[PDB]
């Protein structure tokens, strides 16, 4: 009569456009459409919201998608995964969404040569620029590893010691930290840009 363990749901906000809470219900001996419900703490509305867009993986629910109008950043997100055939098998998680925001990868990588010993890299991230920090990796075709540099809300990196006879490669990614949140996972890497020959 002991209730079975439930899968753990992983929620992530992607560029404050939507939220994907996903789980893997392939552990069940009998397959079941697990149901998702959610609400917010420090909120006078004591109402439980059912999932509006379930995600399916082989005819069984494998997650839920919340639209932007359903996301309350900076309010504690309580998500409840429940077994419909047995309501006693339920699990609730309390999440802080400001630490689970994942922005898109930086876009529009441009290089601008100011002098023969100074060139700058520029990018934009489809996101409030003052809420993102950035990491710039670069390497030449004669470098064994990468070279990273942290860039703040100013989206400008100046290449130290430019060598015109070497071909460079640049990539940048962003993270929702630390001014507007405390996220730990970075965004995906941007497409690589190149310079020189």
């Amino acid at each position: 009569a002991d209730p079975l363990p439930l899968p753990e749901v992983q929620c992530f906000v992607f560029n404050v456009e939507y939220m994907n809470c996903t789980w893997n219900s392939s552990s069940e001996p009998q397959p079941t459409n697990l149901t998702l419900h959610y609400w917010y703490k420090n909120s006078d509305n004591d109402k439980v919201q059912k999932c509006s867009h379930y995600l399916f993986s082989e005819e069984i629910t494998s997650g839920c998608q919340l639209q932007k109008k359903e996301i309350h950043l900076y309010q504690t997100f309580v998500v409840q995964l429940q077994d419909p055939r047995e309501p006693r098998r339920q699990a609730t998680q309390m999440l802080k969404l400001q630490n689970l925001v994942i922005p898109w990868a930086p876009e529009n990588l441009t290089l601008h040569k100011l002098s023969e010993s100074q060139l700058e890299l520029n990018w934009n991230n489809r996101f409030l620029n003052h809420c993102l920090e950035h990491l710039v990796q670069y390497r030449t075709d004669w470098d064994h590893s990468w070279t990273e540099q942290s860039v703040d809300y100013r989206h400008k990196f100046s290449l130290p010691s430019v060598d015109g006879q070497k071909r460079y490669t640049f990539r940048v990614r962003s993270r929702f930290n630390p001014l507007c949140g405390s996220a730990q996972h970075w965004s995906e890497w941007s497409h690589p840009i190149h310079w020189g020959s």
Partner: nanobody
Framework: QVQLQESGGGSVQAGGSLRLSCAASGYTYRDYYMGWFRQAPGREREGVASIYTRGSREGSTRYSSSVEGRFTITLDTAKNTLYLQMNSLKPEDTAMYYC???????????????????????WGQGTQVTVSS
């Protein structure tokens, strides 16, 4: 859509006190964030204080470092009126004070200091505060 209208401004000697009022009207059920901004003569507008309306007064307020411990922002949910108690006013507080309200629960917001201007959709007309020695 909310409609804000400030009041309670004036000209006060240095060290005096003041209390602004900003009555909200319209769709006051969906404005989750409210704040106060001020604009000094010839200078850009800056955030003073911010508050989350539906919290339980548990860390739901944020103030600028320039007014911390001197200004307090409150909210009367029954009358739909925002307040900003101002004490120990110095001449640097002379500015045009605006209240603002926002309905975007998903919007990122600065968690250190006064509110940014981009974090609010609806604004009031303003009230003038003049502090002289």
């Amino acid at each position: 859509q909310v409609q804000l209208q400030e009041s309670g401004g004036g000209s006060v000697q240095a060290g005096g006190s003041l209390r602004l009022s900003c009555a909200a009207s319209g769709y006051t059920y969906r404005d989750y964030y409210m704040g106060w901004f001020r604009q000094a003569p010839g200078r850009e507008r800056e955030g003073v204080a911010s508050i989350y309306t539906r919290g339980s007064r548990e860390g739901s307020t944020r103030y600028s470092s320039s007014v911390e411990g001197r200004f307090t922002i409150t909210l009367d949910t029954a009358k739909n009126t925002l307040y900003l108690q101002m004490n120990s006013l110095k001449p640097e507080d002379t500015a045009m004070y605006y209240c603002a309200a926002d309905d975007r629960t998903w919007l990122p917001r600065v968690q250190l200091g006064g509110p940014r201007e981009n974090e609010y959709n609806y604004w009031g007309q303003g009230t003038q505060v003049t502090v002289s020695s």
